[PDB]
Amino acid sequence: SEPDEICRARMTHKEFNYKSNVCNGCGDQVAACEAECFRNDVYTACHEAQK
């Protein structure tokens, strides 16, 4: 049960890769965005900000 191990084990690779790209495109909030497996308001803000 590692940091980004348990989270991944609950999601598919396609979903994990997709969301990861969204958070990575968020800027310096990468870690914040990644905090809750992309389940956070920053993720929404970042995701909504990306076309």
Side-chain angles (χ1 to χ4, degrees), residues 3-4 29 31 34:
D4 18 71
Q29 308 75 49
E34 282 175 2

Side-chain angles (χ1 to χ4, degrees), residues 4 7-8 11-25 34 37-38 43 47 50:
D4 18 71
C7 226
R8 184 177 65 183
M11 52 174 63
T12 46
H13 288 83
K14 167 174 181 177
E15 186 178 345
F16 173 78
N17 290 337
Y18 174 93
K19 303 283 182 178
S20 181
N21 183 32
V22 174
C23 283
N24 291 340
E34 282 175 2
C37 238
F38 342 121
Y43 167 74
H47 189 295
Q50 292 177 4

